[PDB]
Swiss-Prot record, chain D:
Signal sequence bounds: none
Role played: Key enzyme of the Krebs tricarboxylic acid cycle which catalyzes the synthesis of citrate from acetyl coenzyme A and oxaloacetate.
Binding site for oxaloacetate: R1, R73, R93
Compartment annotation: Mitochondrion matrix
N6-succinyllysine sites (modified residues): K20, K38, K95, K104
Impact when changing K40R: Inhibits methylation
Naturally occurring in which organism (per UniProt): Homo sapiens
Quaternary state and interactors: Homodimer.
Part of the full-length chain shown: 356 to 463 of 466
Location of the active site: D47
List of residues that carry N6-acetyllysine: K20, K27, K38, K104
Residues where N6,N6,N6-trimethyllysine is found: K40
PTM comment: Methylated. Trimethylation at Lys-40 by CSKMT decreases citrate synthase activity.
Protein name as annotated: Citrate synthase, mitochondrial
Amino acid sequence: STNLKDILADLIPKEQARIKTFRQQHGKTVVGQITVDMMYGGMRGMKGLVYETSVLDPDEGIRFRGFSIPECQKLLPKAKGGEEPLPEGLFWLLVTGHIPTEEQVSWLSKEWAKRAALPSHVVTMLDNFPTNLHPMSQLSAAVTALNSESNFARAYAQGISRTKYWELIYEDSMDLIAKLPCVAAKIYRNLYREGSGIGAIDSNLDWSHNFTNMLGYTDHQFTELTRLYLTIHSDHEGGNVSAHTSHLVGSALSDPYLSFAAAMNGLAGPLHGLANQEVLVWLTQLQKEVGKDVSDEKLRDYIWNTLNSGRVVPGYGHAVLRKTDPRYTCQREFALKHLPNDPMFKLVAQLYKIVPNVLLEQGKAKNPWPNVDAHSGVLLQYYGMTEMNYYTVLFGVSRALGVLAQLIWSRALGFPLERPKSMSTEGLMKFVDS
Amino acid sequence: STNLKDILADLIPKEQARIKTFRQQHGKTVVGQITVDMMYGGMRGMKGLVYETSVLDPDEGIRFRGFSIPECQKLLPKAKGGEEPLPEGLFWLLVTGHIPTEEQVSWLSKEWAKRAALPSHVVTMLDNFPTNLHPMSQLSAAVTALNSESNFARAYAQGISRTKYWELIYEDSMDLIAKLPCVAAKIYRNLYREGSGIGAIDSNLDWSHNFTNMLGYTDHQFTELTRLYLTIHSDHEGGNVSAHTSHLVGSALSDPYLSFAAAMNGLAGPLHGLANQEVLVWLTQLQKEVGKDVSDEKLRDYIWNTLNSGRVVPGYGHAVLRKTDPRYTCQREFALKHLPNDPMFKLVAQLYKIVPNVLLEQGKAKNPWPNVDAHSGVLLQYYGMTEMNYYTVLFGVSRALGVLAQLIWSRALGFPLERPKSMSTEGLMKFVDS
Amino acid sequence: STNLKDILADLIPKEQARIKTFRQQHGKTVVGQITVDMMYGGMRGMKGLVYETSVLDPDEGIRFRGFSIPECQKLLPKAKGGEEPLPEGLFWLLVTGHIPTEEQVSWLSKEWAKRAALPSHVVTMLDNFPTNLHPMSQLSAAVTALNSESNFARAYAQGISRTKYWELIYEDSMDLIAKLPCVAAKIYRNLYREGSGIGAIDSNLDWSHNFTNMLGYTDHQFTELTRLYLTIHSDHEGGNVSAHTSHLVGSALSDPYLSFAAAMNGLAGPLHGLANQEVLVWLTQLQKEVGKDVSDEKLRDYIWNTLNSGRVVPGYGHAVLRKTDPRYTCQREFALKHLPNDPMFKLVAQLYKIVPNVLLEQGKAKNPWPNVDAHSGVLLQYYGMTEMNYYTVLFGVSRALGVLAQLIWSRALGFPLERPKSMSTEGLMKFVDS
Amino acid sequence: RYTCQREFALKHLPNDPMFKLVAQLYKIVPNVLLEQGKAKNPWPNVDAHSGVLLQYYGMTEMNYYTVLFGVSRALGVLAQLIWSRALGFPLERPKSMSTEGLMKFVDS
């Protein structure tokens, strides 16, 4: 009806059955080979895990349960005054495989608003963190400290059937998603507003809107930005560091809190979630190296020299994406209908027309197209969100949606310990000989 | 004058060359397949990564740089009036591939003494944690917050050359290893000793003994147990959840504190490290519902009630080991020397004769044999460390040695971001149909 | 060293040496027991013969010199415009144990093009055959009458050293393989194409392509099918009747023509190569009895009848396979690439999902899974190859590749007369009492 | 339709030289087309084979050939035209855009 748990309960047997038969008939099918190079190259090209909530096509980009981002923009419920998709409705889609109705989304906003609550020990810890503790470290530590609230951990300690793991993973994941904006906003306010009162949860407002209120922003357009941002950074299949971390840690039956916190330690990695910032610091420098205004000739020229110094243009390229990221596209659409005459945004666009043709001619790109992180920084900066070290925290809150939707499914489907076999160089040489 | 950083400096270029040559000749060589079953079954027997410090043979158990546990028990230096191997020396071995001298180990003990010091914010955080936040959570949280002290994070922001990454990891790894007993003991004292403050570092003591001093123990044989415990838990190849988590998070260039804290979130999972706590809960439960010395048919009953309830027997089974874990045997060796008659040990021994024939007949176990977690807890209990909820913290402290040894090498060898491909069931069903 | 014959000459001494040593070490090693039941039950389970070219694993399916069919589909050369592996490349693998280069396969295609010719006497024979003489009988007779061309036969008559048998066997085997499409296509055209002139070999075309031309087919897709079919039917270890027959007859130093023709008389048996046809007759009826559109429900119904009838679902089960046959799989993949909406295919596709689980409940079948013969006929019928009595001739042309590859090796390695001991029931009753 | 016409040649004119040339092109053109790439399908259509059949029976007037196609295609298009009206299919009237307009519409 409206209760998401009940809808999910109904789906799991079906999906259990679908997989049982699949594996019966096709369990022994070879889907891929493993080379020495792949073992050294971070499992690049390896089909390593089943992840249900989203799949990243090299060419077309991310699909959430089959739906492209444009399709989500159209089908997923919006706020009443709204153009952008609510993350509530995305989460529903990932969980159910089905586009929610307005009522179902309405229901979920209120579910989340009611679960939004921090215990004193976490509030205290955050309030006591020094200012030189990075926001992703505060988030990670705080979510870890939240596992004192874990239903799944408690229930497992008391013994419980394997068949029932998913129900308590569901309640914990719902609690954590609920609480995350409270943690993330306490960190912002503590760091960047001298500790002012994060403020209330409006039980009739959507999750993003309570978040932007708690951050201390009001522009409806910033709330619309946050709706889109939380929606599109939600999931990116199972192989990205943060998603994989959550899956790997979760497979040992660590609870959602621990699984998510580990994922945030992955997201905090420069090669993962700290790119949005690298981009902005690179854009910033660039506009102060060839002036604010720059013609397509002199910009093209900067890019070629950049590349000749043995240096890459940040926010371009990807591990798996082989074409323009639809997450970039949608941010660009937002930019050009909302802040087309922003200086920093003009540069980002100017690179959009010039950088792809370069890189191609250089050859060493594989993906000469932009990723999400090429665009996200300038948008946040435009609305007043100038504190760049905090940007990944927004990415984190978003990613909880995807990784926790899947965590619920992993445990419902009885996925086991993730535990591959390793080899040393010495050993791998010997194996090769024999 | 001994300096492990200088030995590393020599060794790294040699291994870089070798791996370059090896990949030159064998990079394209197939070393295995991927099946559907593997993808659904947590990558079981998929050869997913290179990990240098230790390798697990299914048949023979763990080797550390080629050396068995028995070999390490004989070859590795010891404390002067001691019999068990110093964990310092194992770390040396893991890092260099060379058995250390007495002098090298002495140096390492002194090095970890000197870098042992906690910042006041971490002190503050630990002192304020509630008694119902699980020790592993306190540990992970505290280690995440230590990342404020990370030299790697700091240097990476400033654009440090990739050729320098390993030196920074080394420095952070040495610091964290040095600090770890400090954190672990404060958690112990705070939870279980009303926050006594006895806990200093003697600069002429080895790491294990300084640890047991801070825990408030005096028995020489507890210190020897601790030395062995920390040595044997140190590393178990790269495909275990904690090692793999560390590897994954560190491949994103997260610093050693973040990589270790995520590792601990994985180690805290019931199907991983937390099993050493769960074993003693399960033992306590069976003793309450039995005598202290039950018949073999009554043990079979208790085990059967566990298995028919959709629960696992803690400490039994393994993803890769296909016989008894040598870390189990070696702990058996210690008990039979030092506490052969202890009642809980007779039970543990008792279960060895019973549990494996069950499990085989239950069918849901490729391996019916015990792992290290089946045996650790009873040794601790004997010496008065009855706090079962603390047991995984000791495991965590030990497992730092292995994962950080490798992390140094991962960075030294330029291993890239770990990013496998995932598929959905729907996506997989279509891939097998084309 | 480029000629196949020279590569082969170089490999032979190594292998003689390797077997000599093995037999020296382990000749008297007992590898199996012989029961009374096995003697009455056609050597079922008995490890009777050394056959180098291919090994059938009960669970995994056939391997050609170590390589799975999926691997052969990836590794063996294709026609320049092609997807499916060339039977040339497979023969090369069987003979040398090595995956050929592209040029090697090219060479072999030209090699078989030059050797492809029939003596007048065999053409008269085929042209004089009546339409009621089954195609397999016409094939066997023609190949037997080709032995007038046997180099080996005449060389043996003039006297030749044991060491030299293989060279002549090679030349006869290459000649026979080249000739077989000419024979097979003359049969087809005489029976079903009103003796139309079969036409010329094109020396730049591969073997299968000249075959489908001479049959009077043009669809490149039928050529691809034919390439795949002749590759996967090539060999199935040595204990299948056709392979065993070739081996046993060959062990008397009967020439390859005699050896192969005898193998075709075995392949013509209903319990061997005539199975493709029974499947197709059965399905045809089934589509008539349950209509050309049927429900999983009503089909599963129809299966349970045919078992309670006492009859077996054709194309399911096998003497040694205990899982789905990879030869079935690869025909499945081809269908759902090239003709997924053929009614007859979709029925076969429905059987794949239902019959497996049904054969299991009934309990009687050791192997509940389909074998190659379940799939082959619907494919041939789809491309217009509707003369069901001819199907086994395609199988025969394929299987020549495997049995002749082994025949060369059997003579190279000096395998002697196959000559087991028999007993009567009377004598076996006596033997057991003693 | 190409294969079907090949069938008819090999039954009734298997040795005609032009049929032979069409048949040799089959072995050659698909590989060249794939190499140039360009076309997603290097395989022949019905029009590759139709004319060499006509030529054989003496209809050498190649500029007439599309008239036979025209006469045939009446059967399909009028069979559907009946049905389009039986079913009340309305005016076919898609929307068009200019490049300018499409550049804008992608930016809004």
